[PDB]
Design a protein around this ligand. Structure first.
Ligand SMILES: Nc1cncn1[C@@H]1O[C@H](CO)[C@@H](O)[C@H]1O
Ligand SMILES: [K+]
Ligand SMILES: [K+]
Ligand SMILES: [K+]
Ligand SMILES: [K+]
Lengths: 299, 298
């Protein structure tokens, strides 16, 4: 089954040595898509980019990794998001990614998967492309994986975040969130005190990522833990997106998901999340099957 | 005497290995300041920068070169200008465009104040430049207005002439390129416009001419200064270099006269040249040793 990813695809600049930046493909949605694609999964990226260097550059990268770019529009009037990794400094302000709209959306088939995060909900057009998209995919008989990726910083009014999150989860089939983002959401301090924020918000199934700990599968049969492999932190940047990638790659393998499948999925997610931090770039270390298992077992 | 430089400072990313860029110090005012400093002149940079990896990078460079950064206010709500040469821009609400009159230090007599058209583009800082020029003049200071044309950066090309005009009014000395004398008047031959600024209120104008040296225009006549014959590799940062060597020389006295003027332009041409023979930009700005090794070699 195809996994549709919609959202941001930037050009992350990672300080190599204090007088020289490193150029590596970036963006939540992008990363997630390249991840799923690298694992041989069938993934299509939906979104907007500038017909500029970063744009074509990023578009090429998508192709090099096997991601379908049939629905990736490049606009020689917009400026593809560039950023400086540190914390995240967002050079390009509006960002061509925010211009996606309901029309850039493709026909969804039954059982396919739709992905998006808080990021894509930030600005005008894109926000409607995400919610309209989610709704359509559900009507088509597909699934939606909403990953609350909280980058509040780049939001105009932090007043909207809860509402979008809320109706976002209503639309979701599965919600992914970090321990960290939970607290920040409903003014918590310890996440457990709010590890139902999403469930009590319409999402019957929520996955909570936890440092190098692993995750937490919350379905009605109960809470389940999956330990994360012993990592060696080089650049955390991209762990979460890698986590979602390995997660969607696993679910697309079938037509209906259950605890059984969710666990195999989460196991895969944790693995990918671990790996992706062993390099210097959101997607540099995203595994290929030949590499996924050399690690799986090896841990 | 101290030379105050106010304006743009941004980082320029230049390609290299397949997947990597190189942080290059850039910006008219920046270069000019680094120039005057890297020549043993006392120079202070006035302006705004983002508190990002970039801003600090630039700020350090300023310190590495001996430029006073006491009035280089760093900020966490602004975004340091960065460009990727393939000369592309990614930061538009600006950053160094936020400097205001409240960021100007106290001026002392005989001190020099510098700025260009660039610093006059966005209205959050255009006031810092004009307010600054005015104060420096009141303090018994001097003003060097360098019309640094860049109609690309301007949204309303209708403002340009007015600001320029008001700039010459405040300035003591105006620096312009032949090419610029044409964009302003239109004349296809700059010799036609050599009195452009003079009519706008500037008693003395210094016209950059590249390989052809400079042409000084003062009330008592015009005096041509030819430039040392050289490679002519990459002409980038040349003008900013020219201004630097120019301000470095004038700051050497308290009241500039005929001789200081004559020498200053000689110095300017020299610096402008060295800028050319080499690639990059600020990576062509000479040190007090090679300037001599150079002069005493042509
Ligand atoms: N594109 C973007 C905007 N704000 C953050 N991001 C992306 O988030 C990803 C990690 O989840 C990074 O690759 C970063 O570029
Ligand atoms: K739901
Ligand atoms: K990484
Ligand atoms: K004047
Ligand atoms: K040069």
């Amino acid at each position: 089954n195809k996994v549709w990813v919609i959202g941001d695809a930037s050009v992350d600049l990672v300080p190599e040595k204090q007088n020289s930046y490193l150029k590596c493909p970036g963006g939540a949605s992008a990363n997630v898509g390249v991840c799923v694609a690298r694992l041989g999964g069938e993934c299509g990226f939906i979104g907007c980019l500038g017909d500029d260097d970063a744009g074509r550059f990023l578009r090429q990268v998508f192709q090099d990794n096997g991601v379908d770019v049939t629905f990736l529009r490049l606009d020689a009037d917009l400026t593809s998001a560039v950023l400086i990794v540190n914390s995240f400094t967002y050079l390009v302000h509006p960002g061509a990614d925010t211009y996606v709209s309901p029309q850039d959306l493709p026909p969804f088939r039954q059982y396919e998967w739709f992905y998006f995060s808080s990021i894509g909900l930030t600005d005008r057009p894109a926000r409607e492309a995400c919610l309209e998209g989610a709704r359509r995919m559900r009507e088509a008989g597909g699934y939606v994986l909403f990953d609350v990726n909280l980058r509040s910083k780049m939001w105009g009014n932090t007043d909207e975040i809860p509402e979008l999150i809320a109706r976002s989860a209503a639309l979701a089939s599965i919600c992914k969130v970090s321990a960290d983002e939970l607290c920040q959401l409903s003014g918590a301090s310890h996440w457990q005190d709010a590890r139902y924020y999403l469930r009590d918000l319409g999402c019957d199934t929520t996955i909570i990522s936890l440092g190098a700990d692993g995750a937490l599968l919350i379905t009605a049969e109960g809470e389940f833990h999956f330990p994360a492999p012993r990592v060696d932190v080089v650049d955390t940047t991209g762990a979460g997106d890698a986590f979602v990638g390995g997660l969607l790659f696993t679910l697309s393998r079938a037509n209906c998901w259950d605890h059984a499948l969710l666990a195999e999925a989460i196991s895969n997610a944790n693995a990918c999340g671990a790996m992706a931090v062993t390099a210097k770039g959101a997607m540099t270390a995203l595994p290929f099957p030949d590499q996924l298992n050399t690690f799986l077992s090896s841990h």
